[PDB]
């Protein structure tokens, strides 16, 4: 199974460690884009040597009470730092917006995917994916991101989550884009409990159905948090734990912010299921 974007191939054999470059105002300070290039490119260097195949590179936060950025500060933002590492490093780049210039600016400098956790629902942003003709990532959310608002009910997240996926897959072929273009993403802690979630983790491995590539994003979140009743810098080992769970039951691409411990762990998770008559757990 592979991807193919920007004249290169990515082989989804085996699992990916998809690191985290967040360039949002509060970080890529000083304003405007300051020397914090410098940091983003350094970040980026650490990450690759580390074993990262894909960075994420995203300049608006997605966490509760999150503010809402221009499409003139993300542009600021975003384009430099995706620009700087194309030309300096072989790595895959998948730009984390929502924004129709946003999206359209970054398949110029060379970005190869479009991670929108909107799943493209702005005003435009479908036909500017479906224009650049790069991969894009549909992710499973119920409600606002930036809520600080409560969890939905669902009758099953399940078959809500998995019929949801067929919505949006119609969605994305009526405007142009092919199914073998997507990757989908069941969305942990985004309008999910606790219960939610883990139930989600637990059936990763019957998401396969679709024949989709699966990303998964589980990094330090709540899900760990609530569980263990611990910091957001003291979430490593759960943080290793779903990332293992994942990987086990098949999933292509991690999203997270320890790269080198997740690199190892999949070093782990790949010389077991080669031993394994199918590779996959369930
Ligand atoms: N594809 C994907 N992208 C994300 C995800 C996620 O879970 N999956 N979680 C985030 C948390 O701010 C930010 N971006
Ligand atoms: N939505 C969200 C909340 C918390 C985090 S974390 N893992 O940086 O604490 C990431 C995304």
Same mark, same amino acid.
């Given at each position: 199974?592979?991807?193919?974007?920007?004249?290169?191939?990515?082989?989804?054999?085996?699992?990916?460690?998809?690191?985290?470059?967040?360039?949002?105002?509060?970080?890529?300070? +000083?304003?405007?884009?300051?020397?914090?290039?410098?940091?983003?490119?350094?970040?980026?260097?650490?990450?690759?040597?580390?074993?990262?195949? $894909?960075?994420?590179?995203?300049?608006?936060?997605?966490?509760?009470?999150?503010?809402?950025?221009?499409? %003139?500060?993300?542009?600021?933002?975003?384009?430099?730092?995706? /620009?700087?590492?194309?030309?300096? !490093?072989?790595?895959?780049?998948?730009?984390?917006?929502? =924004?129709?210039?946003? $999206?359209?600016?970054?398949?110029?400098?060379? &970005?190869? $995917?479009? @991670?929108?956790?909107?799943?493209?629902?702005?005003?435009?942003?479908? /036909?500017?994916?479906?224009?650049?003709?790069?991969?894009?990532?549909?992710?499973?959310?119920?409600?606002?991101?930036?809520?600080?608002? /409560?969890?939905?009910?669902?009758? +099953?997240? !399940?078959?809500?989550? @998995?019929?949801?996926?067929? %919505?949006?897959?119609?969605?994305? %072929?009526?405007?142009?884009?092919? =199914?073998?273009?997507?990757?989908?993403?069941?969305? !942990?802690? !985004?309008?999910?409990?606790?219960?939610?979630?883990?139930?989600?983790?637990?059936?990763?491995?019957?998401?396969?159905?679709?024949?989709?590539?699966?990303?998964?994003?589980?990094?330090? =979140?709540?899900?760990?948090?609530?569980?263990?009743?611990?910091?957001?810098?003291?979430?490593?080992?759960?943080?290793? &734990?779903?990332?293992? $769970?994942?990987?086990?039951?098949?999933?292509?691409?991690?999203?997270?912010?320890?790269? =080198?411990?997740?690199?190892?762990?999949?070093?782990?998770?790949?010389?077991?299921?080669?031993?394994? /008559?199918?590779?996959?757990?369930?």
């Amino acid at each position: 199974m592979k991807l193919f974007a920007q004249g290169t191939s990515l082989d989804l054999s085996h699992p990916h460690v998809m690191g985290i470059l967040n360039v949002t105002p509060d970080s890529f300070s +000083d304003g405007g884009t300051h020397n914090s290039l410098i940091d983003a490119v350094k970040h980026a260097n650490l990450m690759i040597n580390a074993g990262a195949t $894909i960075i994420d590179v995203g300049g608006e936060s997605t966490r509760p009470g999150a503010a809402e950025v221009s499409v %003139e500060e993300e542009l600021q933002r975003v384009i430099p730092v995706v /620009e700087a590492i194309a030309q300096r !490093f072989e790595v895959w780049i998948s730009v984390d917006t929502s =924004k129709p210039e946003v $999206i359209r600016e970054s398949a110029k400098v060379g &970005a190869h $995917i479009i @991670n929108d956790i909107r799943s493209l629902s702005e005003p435009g942003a479908l /036909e500017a994916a479906a224009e650049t003709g790069l991969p894009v990532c549909l992710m499973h959310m119920q409600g606002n991101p930036k809520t600080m608002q /409560e969890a939905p009910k669902y009758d +099953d997240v !399940f078959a809500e989550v @998995n019929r949801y996926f067929i %919505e949006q897959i119609a969605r994305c %072929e009526q405007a142009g884009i092919a =199914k073998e273009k997507l990757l989908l993403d069941p969305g !942990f802690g !985004f309008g999910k409990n606790l219960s939610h979630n883990y139930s989600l983790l637990a059936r990763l491995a019957e998401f396969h159905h679709f024949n989709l590539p699966l990303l998964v994003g589980m990094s330090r =979140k709540s899900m760990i948090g609530q569980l263990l009743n611990v910091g957001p810098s003291e979430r490593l080992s759960g943080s290793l &734990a779903c990332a293992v $769970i994942a990987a086990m039951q098949g999933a292509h691409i991690i999203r997270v912010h320890d790269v =080198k411990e997740t690199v190892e762990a999949m070093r782990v998770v790949e010389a077991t299921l080669s031993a394994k /008559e199918n590779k996959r757990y369930e």
